[PDB]
């Protein structure tokens, strides 16, 4: 959570607003998580919904409307996504004055059917199904047309958490050098309809439900224009980071995941073998992004020595330009 948002959020006050805006009682709202947004389950007329709250420090209403517009496009095209629900005043986003020049932004979505994947689900069938779904998502995004420039989502390199100098101590000169080199390397990549588009940009097993083999995604809060190969790499990063079943051999796991994923992906979208060589760079970019996120979450003048000790490990991985995995992804060519 962005440290400046955490500092201003008063939960009982803003949830009181939600009660009137969505026509529920406080007892119908249940906390889920507070990672990037404040997320709650909201019960109304038998059914379950999901309330996500954020703030203008990190999101504008128009930017969120660009998320909703893409969601609509995907749902129209037959992809299972969790759709927004309007407030009692008919709004997709409710804006609440914080009293200090900003706004809390509330929005509600349908609760995706099924559940997050568990050990019994963490297998080749899942990885294949993720590939099929992601392929379908990328094919569908090729026909997306932005209705209004107000709602334009960011390009990959505009991401706030990649602005390391804003959040990381100025003395970490090698960190900035390696990050700069990497973003300069990825900026050399070509972009066309078949390689680059509006993508989810945070695929992971906290952001979808599995309902007897059927995937429904959510958490479209970070969508942006990006390479299809990067969208895939971000999922890989995430499954390597938080594996449902812990692994002893990282390379072997990465290779098997990608083998199964790509079998499914290839049934639904064409992407050239040349992109496989860039997976390691995209994995390194995610690591840089996480280092930025962590610094945007922490005040280094107050955090503990233990947190600093863990941050030191991440710092050195970035300074080394250490590969996330030793698996040679080029061997997964068709």
Binding stretches for ligand ANP (CB under 6 A): 32-33, 35-37, 39, 50, 82, 109, 111-112, 116, 202, 206-207, 209, 218-219, 221
List of residues 6+ apart from 330 with CB closer than 8 A: 273, 276, 277
The residue (of 107 and 138) whose beta carbon lies closer to Cl ion is 107
- From the CB of 263, what's the least distance to ligand ANP, in Å? 26
> For residue 231, how far is the Cα from the chain centroid?
10
User: Which residues contact Cl ion by CB under 5 A?
Assistant: 30-31, 91-93, 123-124, 163-165
Contact between 159 and ligand UAM by CB under 6 A: the answer reads yes
Contact between 250 and its own copies by CB under 8 A: the answer reads yes
In angstroms, rounded to a whole number, what is the distance separating the alpha carbons of residues 291 and 160?
Answer: 12
In angstroms, rounded to a whole number, what is the distance separating the alpha carbons of residues 59 and 54?
Answer: 7
List of residues 6+ apart from 174 with CB closer than 8 A: 319
Residue 126 gets which letter from DSSP?
Answer: H
Contact between 207 and Mg ion by CB under 5 A: the answer reads yes
Contact between 170 and its own copies by CB under 8 A: the answer reads no
- From the CB of 250, what's the least distance to ligand ANP, in Å? 22
Half-sphere exposure in the Cβ direction for 276 (13 Å, CA)? 18
Could you tell me if 38 and 11 are in contact, meaning their C-beta atoms sit under 8 angstroms apart? yes
Contact between 31 and ligand UAM by CB under 6 A: the answer reads no
CB nearest ligand UAM: which residue? 206
Which is nearest to 154 in space by CA: 83, 79, 237, 64?
Answer: 64
Q: By CB under 8 A, which span of 109-117, 193-201, 218-226, 319-327 interacts with its own copies? A: 319-327
Total residues contacting its own copies by CB under 8 A comes to 39
In angstroms, rounded to a whole number, what is the distance separating the alpha carbons of residues 36 and 41?
Answer: 16
- Exactly one of 222, 268, 317, 319 binds ligand UAM (CB under 6 A); that residue is 222
Interface contacts to its own copies, rule CB under 8 A: 1, 33-35, 172-175, 178, 240-243, 246-250, 290, 293-294, 297-298, 304-307, 309-316, 319-322
């Amino acid at each position: 959570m962005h440290k400046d948002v955490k500092a201003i959020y008063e939960e009982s006050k803003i949830l009181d607003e939600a009660t009137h805006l969505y026509g529920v009682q406080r007892s119908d709202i249940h906390f889920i998580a507070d990672a990037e947004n404040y997320v709650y389950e909201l019960k109304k007329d038998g059914e379950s919904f999901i309330l996500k709250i954020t703030h203008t420090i990190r999101r504008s209403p128009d930017y969120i409307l660009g998320e909703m517009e893409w969601l609509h496009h995907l749902a129209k095209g037959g992809l299972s996504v969790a759709k927004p629900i309007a407030s009692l005043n008919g709004r997709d986003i409710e804006q609440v004055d914080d009293g200090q020049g900003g706004s809390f932004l509330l929005r509600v979505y349908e609760k995706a059917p099924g559940h997050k994947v568990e050990e019994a689900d963490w297998n080749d069938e899942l990885f294949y199904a993720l590939g099929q779904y992601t392929g379908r998502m990328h094919k569908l995004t090729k026909s997306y047309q932005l209705s209004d420039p107000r709602y334009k989502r960011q390009e990959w390199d505009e991401e706030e958490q990649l602005k390391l100098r804003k959040y990381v101590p100025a003395d970490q000169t090698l960190v900035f050098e390696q990050a700069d080199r990497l973003m300069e390397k990825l900026a050399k990549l070509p972009k066309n309809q078949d390689t680059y588009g509006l993508v989810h940009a945070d695929l992971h097993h906290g952001n979808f439900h599995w309902d007897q083999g059927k995937i429904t995604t959510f958490d479209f809060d970070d969508i942006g224009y990006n390479w299809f190969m990067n969208d895939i790499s971000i999922l890989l990063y995430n499954v390597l980071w938080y594996p449902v079943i812990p692994y002893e051999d990282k390379a072997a796991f990465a290779g098997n995941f990608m083998k199964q994923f790509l079998k499914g992906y290839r049934e639904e979208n064409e992407l050239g073998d040349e992109w496989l060589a860039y997976i390691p760079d995209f994995l390194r970019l995610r690591h840089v992004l996480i280092y930025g996120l962590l610094h945007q979450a922490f005040d280094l003048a107050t955090i503990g020595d233990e947190e600093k000790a863990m941050l030191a490990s991440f710092r050195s991985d970035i300074e080394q330009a250490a590969p996330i995995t030793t698996f040679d992804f080029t061997k997964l060519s068709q």
